[PDB]
Amino acid sequence: PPDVLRWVELAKLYRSIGEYDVLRGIFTSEIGTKQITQSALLAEARSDYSEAAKQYDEALNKQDWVDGEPTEAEKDFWELASLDCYNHLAEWKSLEYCSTASIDSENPPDLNKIWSEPFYQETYLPYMIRSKLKLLLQGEADQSLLTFIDKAMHGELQKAILELHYSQELSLLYLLQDDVDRAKYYIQNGIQSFMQNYSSIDVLLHQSRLTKLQSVQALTEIQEFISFISKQGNLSSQVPLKRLLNTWTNRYPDAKMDPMNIWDDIITNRCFFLSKIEEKLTDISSLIRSCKFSMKMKMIDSARKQNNFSLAMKLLKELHKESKTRDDWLVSWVQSYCRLSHCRSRSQGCSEQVLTVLKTVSLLDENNVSSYLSKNILAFRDQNILLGTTYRIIANALSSEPACLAEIEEDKARRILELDSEKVIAGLYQRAFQHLSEAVQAAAGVIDAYMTLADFCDQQLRKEEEQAYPALVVEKMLKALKLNSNEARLKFPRLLQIIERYPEETLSLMTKEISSVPCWQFISWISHMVALLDKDQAVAVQHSVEEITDNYPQAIVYPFIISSESYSFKDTSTGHKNKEFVARIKSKLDQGGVIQDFINALDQLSNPELLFKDWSNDVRAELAKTPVNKKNIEKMYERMYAALGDPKAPGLGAFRRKFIQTFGKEFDKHFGKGGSKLLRMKLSDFNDITNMLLLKMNKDSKPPGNLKECSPWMSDFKVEFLRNELEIPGQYDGRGKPLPEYHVRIAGFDERVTVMASLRRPKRIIIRGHDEREHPFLVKGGEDLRQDQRVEQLFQVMNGILAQDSACSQRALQLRTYSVVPMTSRLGLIEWLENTVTLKDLLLNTMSQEEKAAYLSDPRAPPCEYKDWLTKMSGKHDVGAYMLMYKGANRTETVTSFRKRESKVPADLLKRAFVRMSTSPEAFLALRSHFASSHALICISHWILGIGDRHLNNFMVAMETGGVIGIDFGHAFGSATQFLPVPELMPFRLTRQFINLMLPMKETGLMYSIMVHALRAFRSDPGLLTNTMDVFVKEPSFDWKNFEQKMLKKGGSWIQEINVAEKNWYPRQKICYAKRKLAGANPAVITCDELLLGHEKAPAFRDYVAVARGSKDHNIRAQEPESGLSEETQVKCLMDQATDPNILGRTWEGWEPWM
């Protein structure tokens, strides 16, 4: 057929530019029609190339398999993919046969049969000659290849190909017989071909150029050895060998970023070179043997770190005779082995989990224990660490499955009980603690030793939440945090919660350990120590806060206004010195009086008409809950009057704001009424006059400033002398010792204000710097911007996680964070990245003048159609029809209506949007591949902490690289799907256009291996993300109060009728749920549990649990169990949940689920 070989040639094109995701995106959609195809591609996605090749010979050789026949396009693809999956690991002997055995049978003539039918030439010859040269380079006679080379090296057909393409294999071939003149000619033609090829590629096709550029080390190592032995003063001595070995032994490629066949090229070339120089200059070889072993051990340790396991295991087997001259080479051997089994166990089930670590117990009664690990103490420390970790791993898996392992494998159970049935679990915990308590008794090789005790005792105490360990946590964590850590630096609120919940245990010794500290690491945890001053037990952290306020007094200022806007002290004798200490710090900071002038400057440019409504909704709900609260209106009216009122009030307050001439002048007539009654109302009877006064101030002709004259302090800043310079906000973020003399000091503003078209209308200011990089910014007054600061701290630890799992780093996965700063409470600055467009306006201005016209203005538009659908399926013309549409509609009517309403917008919208500005078909690839990879990463990372409300304008593309920005974080942990009237059940947003950027590829090509590599990068870790989620939700800013207030800032759907919302917050629940869907959980269980905890006793709860629950006919989220899953199954149920017209027919009318 025509349209199957076109898929074979799209595979042949997309295979050559790296691009292995959309390669496997067609080997399941079109060249499929089996089960072994999916069951080997789904196990070749991860680096499991010893099972996905094992079930290829059981798809070729089969005999019967009758339900059709493996069709004419895949019986060859199985052989080719078997060749790739044989090459990616070291299969040398089993490659030559399966590469030769399809041109002729019974020992084929591999001499001229390839040169006829050139279908044998492109796809069989490269792996053939590569396998043959590699198996030449390990030591035999083998006598097969030189003869084909000499025979074929005559002609123009059989010689104008083999030297145009290869040249480097040929170069090694000729140096196998030491004729080093034409071989040097061949390597010179190799370098010339590389330069012309690298010139021929386009510039922005990344990973093609990387795959080219990863080879010049191989070429130059060939060239350096050729001109090393052929030059004279090298075989007469040993010191050129010594300098050449020292410059060799540094220049490995990196781990974690360059795949394993380049390591195999360079190490095989190098060891063959070393045997050649030991042959020519014939101690001379013990140095060479040791350097060869160390290079192979580096090869092994980098082979472990990308989940390339069997390629490490066979190398351990090739090395096992080698490391037996002395004890230390075995202790490196067994170190690598135990590390290999330890990382090997971390993705399996449970019964195999004990078995895959139980084998590494017997070989630790082995040698190198007596008189080696008693004078060499550092590997002894590592030995204690891995042993304690071993028994920890056994008892950690053995206690989830409670007793279901001591019923089988009788010798294994007797070997376990060698070292009843329930005291053995705590006995093996204790048997780990013997070695881990020897660990601290026996740089940068001890930070791990301290931190492993730290998290063993931490998980042990969170097991005891259902013994003198809390004195082992604090000293042994802080004596490593005194060193530079980036793991203990992220584990400070663990100390600051073990100390509160374990108060009498080691409280002054905590002060004795935190005393001698470098006081420049806590500058990220400053907002969790300046809220510790007000409560009891602030005496452990007073000297450290004094040290910050004396050394670096600017990096604590804006974390003091927020913590002294609300503080109420104790009244006992120990609770009296704290107000003295706080007043001392308050009067030893802000001495210049210019920082509060700055905050008042950035306060006095807001919009006042949208500022009075905050007082309106702050006093209309204070007096109407219980009229027993005293001195609360007379004590809040100064915060309204000292800003707004008579224009003598700011004339005493800050300075002449030019809008007050039209506002504070204007409201004396309708503030005489306030002085007569509203200064003394206390009554709650008549709010219509305040609402019509809001209407009276509404619809002004010019609210904005139209210059910087909305705050004349700032138009003429003009620094004069040593008067406490301002030091522009948003720096000092952990990470070494900050040098304040090089930070940017703000030195001028610009005379243009621009208003943003958000709901609250913020403003954009163009503030300069003392280095002239005129930084723009955004002002946000009247919203508590600590929550966005928290989620950007989350994203910083999150995409620190995403740069260590190597399959994520080789595609370079990274979130895009942007800096937000809360100056005081309800006033803060937002960064503003230049040159970015919102998603909804990109899709809008891409459309023609008439498609946008019939999308905006017609009843056949999908908005008005959804409106009529809702008012006819329920009956009423308003909101609240969602309560009855769930119970008046069925699974086969909603889907048909959803297709009829989504077939109105043109599906050629993101594609035409990129066509309009791409201007080259070599730029369309890299302007669509980066959109798809970035959108996949943000939709998997907006789910582990489930950030609901991903509607249109909360995404921002960047017109230089087409990448999406995620902004506007309101509902951090799973809380949008509870408290709203009609919830949001979908885990992210994949509507129509985000799929029609991928036709004809079905949505398993590029948006799937990104998601699986991200989710496997998250859940294999000790729980840093779990602990930072744990300590975010136990920091008091959000005990439903500021929550409901920011719910009502944007005036909308949520109003009242709560009654459990003051009672079912429960931060024991949200960390339980994130621990569940990070430790394996069905994504229909979690939406049902979250929907039960906030929508019990609703009228339509059955429809809610139905649409979340599944159907078992069509939808794959129902046919799976509820626990213990795998990553591809999680993301398959997740992808079904995101687009399923059972769900997206029933969601919010402004959330835009169609477009």
mmCIF file of C-alpha atoms in Angstrom, residues 642-781:
data_model
loop_
_atom_site.group_PDB
_atom_site.id
_atom_site.type_symbol
_atom_site.label_atom_id
_atom_site.label_comp_id
_atom_site.label_asym_id
_atom_site.label_seq_id
_atom_site.Cartn_x
_atom_site.Cartn_y
_atom_site.Cartn_z
ATOM 1 C CA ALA A 642 -5.312 57.719 57.016
ATOM 2 C CA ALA A 643 -5.212 56.945 53.305
ATOM 3 C CA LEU A 644 -8.616 58.191 52.097
ATOM 4 C CA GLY A 645 -10.661 61.190 53.215
ATOM 5 C CA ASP A 646 -9.753 64.882 53.392
ATOM 6 C CA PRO A 647 -6.665 65.939 51.368
ATOM 7 C CA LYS A 648 -5.085 67.141 54.581
ATOM 8 C CA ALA A 649 -5.025 63.494 55.670
ATOM 9 C CA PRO A 650 -2.358 62.497 53.073
ATOM 10 C CA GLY A 651 -0.841 65.954 53.461
ATOM 11 C CA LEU A 652 0.016 64.773 56.935
ATOM 12 C CA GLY A 653 0.279 61.132 55.858
ATOM 13 C CA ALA A 654 2.693 60.727 52.992
ATOM 14 C CA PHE A 655 2.709 63.251 50.147
ATOM 15 C CA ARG A 656 0.635 64.835 47.426
ATOM 16 C CA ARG A 657 -0.688 62.102 45.198
ATOM 17 C CA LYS A 658 -2.110 63.851 42.142
ATOM 18 C CA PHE A 659 -5.243 61.688 42.084
ATOM 19 C CA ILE A 660 -6.169 62.861 45.581
ATOM 20 C CA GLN A 661 -6.885 66.317 44.132
ATOM 21 C CA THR A 662 -9.780 64.660 42.311
ATOM 22 C CA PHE A 663 -10.671 62.133 45.031
ATOM 23 C CA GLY A 664 -9.923 63.441 48.530
ATOM 24 C CA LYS A 665 -11.271 66.822 47.496
ATOM 25 C CA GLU A 666 -14.288 65.115 45.941
ATOM 26 C CA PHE A 667 -15.265 63.104 49.017
ATOM 27 C CA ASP A 668 -15.882 65.692 51.702
ATOM 28 C CA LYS A 669 -19.547 66.195 50.789
ATOM 29 C CA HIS A 670 -20.229 62.451 51.032
ATOM 30 C CA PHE A 671 -17.887 62.083 53.992
ATOM 31 C CA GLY A 672 -19.718 64.594 56.154
ATOM 32 C CA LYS A 673 -22.381 61.883 56.149
ATOM 33 C CA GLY A 674 -19.716 59.428 57.269
ATOM 34 C CA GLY A 675 -18.564 61.623 60.120
ATOM 35 C CA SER A 676 -22.173 62.160 61.187
ATOM 36 C CA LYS A 677 -23.317 58.509 61.081
ATOM 37 C CA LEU A 678 -20.788 56.076 59.590
ATOM 38 C CA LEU A 679 -18.068 56.901 62.099
ATOM 39 C CA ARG A 680 -20.491 55.591 64.759
ATOM 40 C CA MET A 681 -22.897 53.170 63.039
ATOM 41 C CA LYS A 682 -22.360 49.659 64.589
ATOM 42 C CA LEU A 683 -25.805 48.872 63.228
ATOM 43 C CA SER A 684 -26.041 46.777 59.966
ATOM 44 C CA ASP A 685 -29.234 48.107 58.429
ATOM 45 C CA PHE A 686 -28.423 50.237 55.407
ATOM 46 C CA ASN A 687 -25.566 49.316 53.063
ATOM 47 C CA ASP A 688 -27.370 50.558 49.950
ATOM 48 C CA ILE A 689 -25.939 54.039 50.504
ATOM 49 C CA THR A 690 -22.400 52.602 50.517
ATOM 50 C CA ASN A 691 -23.092 50.535 47.403
ATOM 51 C CA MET A 692 -24.582 53.536 45.599
ATOM 52 C CA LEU A 693 -21.629 55.606 46.809
ATOM 53 C CA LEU A 694 -19.431 53.014 45.114
ATOM 54 C CA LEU A 695 -21.615 53.504 42.029
ATOM 55 C CA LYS A 696 -21.204 57.271 42.468
ATOM 56 C CA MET A 697 -17.421 56.993 42.414
ATOM 57 C CA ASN A 698 -17.597 54.464 39.562
ATOM 58 C CA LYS A 699 -17.221 55.351 35.878
ATOM 59 C CA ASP A 700 -14.694 58.166 36.154
ATOM 60 C CA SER A 701 -13.116 59.633 33.030
ATOM 61 C CA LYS A 702 -9.420 59.247 33.962
ATOM 62 C CA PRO A 703 -8.411 56.936 36.808
ATOM 63 C CA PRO A 704 -4.796 56.237 35.676
ATOM 64 C CA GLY A 705 -1.936 58.655 36.033
ATOM 65 C CA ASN A 706 -0.827 58.936 32.346
ATOM 66 C CA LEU A 707 2.694 59.724 33.695
ATOM 67 C CA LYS A 708 4.738 58.942 36.810
ATOM 68 C CA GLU A 709 2.848 61.890 38.445
ATOM 69 C CA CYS A 710 0.637 59.386 40.278
ATOM 70 C CA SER A 711 3.480 59.347 42.838
ATOM 71 C CA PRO A 712 5.815 62.363 42.773
ATOM 72 C CA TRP A 713 8.245 60.887 45.278
ATOM 73 C CA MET A 714 9.517 58.634 42.535
ATOM 74 C CA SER A 715 9.831 60.830 39.425
ATOM 75 C CA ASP A 716 12.964 62.446 40.910
ATOM 76 C CA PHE A 717 14.490 59.746 43.106
ATOM 77 C CA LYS A 718 18.103 61.066 42.627
ATOM 78 C CA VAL A 719 20.405 59.406 45.166
ATOM 79 C CA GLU A 720 22.506 61.956 47.080
ATOM 80 C CA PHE A 721 24.977 60.490 49.588
ATOM 81 C CA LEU A 722 25.475 57.725 52.160
ATOM 82 C CA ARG A 723 21.789 57.621 53.098
ATOM 83 C CA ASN A 724 20.875 53.871 52.979
ATOM 84 C CA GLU A 725 20.443 53.079 49.269
ATOM 85 C CA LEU A 726 17.398 51.006 48.440
ATOM 86 C CA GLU A 727 18.876 47.793 46.885
ATOM 87 C CA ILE A 728 16.137 46.633 44.388
ATOM 88 C CA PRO A 729 14.128 43.684 45.807
ATOM 89 C CA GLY A 730 14.142 40.002 45.096
ATOM 90 C CA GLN A 731 17.692 38.814 45.582
ATOM 91 C CA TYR A 732 19.528 36.966 48.410
ATOM 92 C CA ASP A 733 18.305 33.442 47.664
ATOM 93 C CA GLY A 734 20.330 30.928 49.667
ATOM 94 C CA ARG A 735 23.168 29.482 47.665
ATOM 95 C CA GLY A 736 26.458 30.711 49.015
ATOM 96 C CA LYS A 737 27.578 33.944 50.593
ATOM 97 C CA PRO A 738 25.893 36.980 49.033
ATOM 98 C CA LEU A 739 28.092 39.970 48.276
ATOM 99 C CA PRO A 740 25.899 43.063 48.784
ATOM 100 C CA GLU A 741 28.347 45.437 47.125
ATOM 101 C CA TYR A 742 27.604 43.906 43.710
ATOM 102 C CA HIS A 743 23.831 43.729 43.885
ATOM 103 C CA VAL A 744 21.876 46.169 41.765
ATOM 104 C CA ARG A 745 21.043 49.424 43.550
ATOM 105 C CA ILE A 746 18.042 51.228 42.117
ATOM 106 C CA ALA A 747 18.844 54.685 40.786
ATOM 107 C CA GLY A 748 15.938 56.088 38.873
ATOM 108 C CA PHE A 749 12.461 55.614 37.466
ATOM 109 C CA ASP A 750 10.766 56.369 34.177
ATOM 110 C CA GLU A 751 7.861 58.614 33.314
ATOM 111 C CA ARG A 752 5.464 56.048 31.845
ATOM 112 C CA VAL A 753 2.771 54.003 33.587
ATOM 113 C CA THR A 754 0.828 51.302 31.776
ATOM 114 C CA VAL A 755 -2.194 49.486 33.162
ATOM 115 C CA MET A 756 -2.626 45.749 32.745
ATOM 116 C CA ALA A 757 -5.878 44.204 31.554
ATOM 117 C CA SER A 758 -6.275 41.729 34.372
ATOM 118 C CA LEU A 759 -9.280 41.897 36.671
ATOM 119 C CA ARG A 760 -7.635 44.090 39.313
ATOM 120 C CA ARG A 761 -5.812 46.289 36.705
ATOM 121 C CA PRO A 762 -2.209 46.350 37.974
ATOM 122 C CA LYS A 763 0.427 48.744 36.634
ATOM 123 C CA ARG A 764 3.846 48.381 35.013
ATOM 124 C CA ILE A 765 6.909 50.437 36.006
ATOM 125 C CA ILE A 766 10.186 50.664 34.188
ATOM 126 C CA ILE A 767 12.651 51.143 36.994
ATOM 127 C CA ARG A 768 16.290 51.596 36.031
ATOM 128 C CA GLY A 769 19.382 50.309 37.729
ATOM 129 C CA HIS A 770 22.898 51.334 38.551
ATOM 130 C CA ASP A 771 24.119 49.125 35.727
ATOM 131 C CA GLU A 772 21.557 50.312 33.095
ATOM 132 C CA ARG A 773 19.484 47.251 32.479
ATOM 133 C CA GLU A 774 16.105 48.937 32.753
ATOM 134 C CA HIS A 775 14.104 46.318 34.592
ATOM 135 C CA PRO A 776 10.347 46.445 34.163
ATOM 136 C CA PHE A 777 8.115 45.259 36.961
ATOM 137 C CA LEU A 778 4.474 44.928 37.944
ATOM 138 C CA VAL A 779 2.870 46.317 41.086
ATOM 139 C CA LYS A 780 0.239 44.359 43.007
ATOM 140 C CA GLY A 781 -1.263 46.168 45.980
#
